[PDB]
Enzyme design. Structure first.
Site, PDB file in Angstrom:
ATOM      1  CG  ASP A  96      57.947  -1.975  21.181  1.00  0.00           C
ATOM      2  OD1 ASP A  96      57.663  -0.754  21.285  1.00  0.00           O
ATOM      3  OD2 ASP A  96      58.803  -2.428  20.335  1.00  0.00           O
ATOM      4  CD  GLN A 139      67.085  -2.998  11.941  1.00  0.00           C
ATOM      5  OE1 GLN A 139      67.802  -3.709  11.237  1.00  0.00           O
ATOM      6  NE2 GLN A 139      66.446  -3.458  13.010  1.00  0.00           N
ATOM      7  N   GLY A 140      62.894  -0.461   9.846  1.00  0.00           N
ATOM      8  CA  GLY A 140      61.883   0.210   9.111  1.00  0.00           C
ATOM      9  C   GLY A 140      60.556  -0.533   9.062  1.00  0.00           C
ATOM     10  CG  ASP A 141      59.954  -4.360   7.792  1.00  0.00           C
ATOM     11  OD1 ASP A 141      59.368  -3.734   6.886  1.00  0.00           O
ATOM     12  OD2 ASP A 141      60.849  -5.226   7.589  1.00  0.00           O
ATOM     13  CB  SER A 142      59.751  -1.030  14.175  1.00  0.00           C
ATOM     14  OG  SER A 142      60.943  -1.740  14.436  1.00  0.00           O
ATOM     15  CG  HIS A 172      60.701   0.607  18.993  1.00  0.00           C
ATOM     16  ND1 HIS A 172      60.182  -0.630  18.766  1.00  0.00           N
ATOM     17  CD2 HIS A 172      61.371   0.951  17.831  1.00  0.00           C
ATOM     18  CE1 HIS A 172      60.506  -1.050  17.566  1.00  0.00           C
ATOM     19  NE2 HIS A 172      61.239  -0.092  16.979  1.00  0.00           N
TER      20      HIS A 172
END
Length: 224
Positions: free
Chosen positions: A84, A177-180, A41
């Site tokens: 993912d 969020q931002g660690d994905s 993603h």
């Protein structure tokens, strides 16, 4: 990362930051000199020219070695949150040495055991919906949550055999969020997953959900 501490130099020799349009976006793991593993993603369908990888630094914006992308390949069964993972090929090869190294992967068919201790790292928010992110890499250690308990939290169909979960029942320690796309390792620093999704960040009774390297080795091995 919520509830984390600063990573030390050399903690994750293979970790990369993935900037997009010059700003923070995702993390990833350097598999070899021209290949990064991240979450699908983070990259699927976006303009590839927008991305820049940086290896060998505790920061996203200076140090180490950068590369643009040559190609992007998402898992052939990527759908929704499922499967993912994506393989990125680098325009500039990145040599191991110093604080750069390549990831060792969880064994094919392995599945993290509930209650074992995993460590996740990244440059994402320190609170749900936070707008500011840290300059230097953070990490946090959380236990694996059984797939059964994770399915009780999210639904039976929502958690697949290509996902595993980790977190504390009380919340307070998680990826966000931002660690994905960045790494989650076992206690030996073997790469067991990539940050994928969850219901908010660090909430009680809602585990973080990770794309499982042990479950997705055929794809990784074929294209790395």
């Amino acid at each position: 990362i919520v509830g984390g501490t600063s990573a030390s130099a050399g903690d994750f020799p293979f970790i990369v930051s993935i900037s997009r349009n010059g700003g923070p976006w995702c993390g990833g793991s350097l598999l070899n000199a021209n290949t990064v593993l991240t979450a699908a993603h983070c990259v699927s369908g976006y303009a590839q020219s927008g991305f820049q990888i940086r290896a060998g630094s505790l920061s996203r914006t200076s140090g180490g070695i950068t590369s643009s992308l040559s190609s992007v390949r998402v898992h052939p069964s990527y759908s929704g949150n499922n499967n993912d993972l994506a393989i990125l090929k680098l325009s500039t090869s990145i040599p191991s040495g110093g604080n750069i190294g390549y990831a060792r992967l969880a064994a094919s068919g392995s599945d993290p055991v509930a209650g074992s201790s995993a460590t996740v790292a990244g440059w994402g928010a320190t609170s749900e919906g936070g707008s500011s992110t840290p300059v230097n890499l953070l990490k946090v250690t959380v236990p694996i949550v059984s797939r059964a308990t994770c399915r009780a939290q999210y639904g039976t169909s929502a958690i697949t055999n290509q996902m595993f979960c980790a977190g504390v029942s009380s919340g307070g320690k998680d990826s966000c969020q931002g660690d994905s796309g960045g790494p989650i390792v076992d206690s030996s620093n073997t790469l067991i997953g990539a940050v994928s999704w969850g219901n908010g960040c660090a909430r009680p009774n809602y585990s973080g959900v990770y794309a499982s390297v042990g479950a997705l080795r055929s794809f990784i091995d074929t294209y790395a």
